[PDB]
C-alpha cells in the first residue's frame, strides 16, 4: 500500500497521526496484538464505544 493509496482509504487525522517514515508503513515486530471479534462495520463499533463511554463518564466527570 502506497501513501496515496492509504490516504484514499483512511481519514486525514488517522493518516496524520501515524506519519509524524519514507512513505511506507513500517510496523515493527512487537507492535501489534491480534484480537478476534465479530465482523462489524467501523462506524457502528465506534458508535457503540461512544455510547458506552458517555454512559460511563457521566457520573464521574460530567464536564
Amino acid at each position: 500500500f502506497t501513501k496515496e493509496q492509504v490516504f484514499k482509504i483512511v481519514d486525514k487525522k488517522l493518516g496524520d497521526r501515524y506519519f509524524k517514515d519514507d512513505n511506507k508503513i513500517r510496523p515493527l515486530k512487537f507492535d501489534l496484538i491480534l484480537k478476534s471479534q465479530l465482523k462489524t462495520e467501523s462506524r457502528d463499533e465506534k458508535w457503540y464505544n461512544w455510547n458506552e463511554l458517555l454512559k460511563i463518564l457521566a457520573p464521574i466527570r460530567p464536564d
Binding site: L38, T40, R43, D44, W47, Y48
Partner: protein, 67 residues
C-alpha cells in the same frame, strides 16, 4: 407417515420453529443493529440471498453513477 412428515420439517431447516419470535426480534432497526439471530438451519439460504443482494446493488450503483 407421521415420522416422515416431521422429518420433512426437520430436513428443510424449519426445526427450532421461532420464526414468529424472529420477526418480532427484527423490530429494533434503530441505528446500529445486527441480524438479531433466530434460526440456524435456513441461514445458508439467507446468506446466499444477502450475497446476491450485495451483487445486485453493486451493479445498480455502477449503473446509477454512470447513466
Amino acid at each position: 407417515a407421521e415420522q416422515k412428515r416431521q422429518l420433512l420439517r426437520l430436513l428443510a431447516g424449519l426445526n427450532d420453529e421461532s420464526l414468529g419470535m424472529a420477526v418480532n426480534r427484527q423490530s429494533g432497526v434503530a441505528i446500529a443493529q445486527r441480524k438479531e439471530s433466530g434460526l440456524m438451519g435456513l441461514q445458508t439460504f439467507l446468506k446466499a440471498t444477502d450475497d446476491m443482494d450485495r451483487l445486485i446493488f453493486r451493479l445498480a450503483v455502477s449503473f446509477i453513477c454512470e447513466y
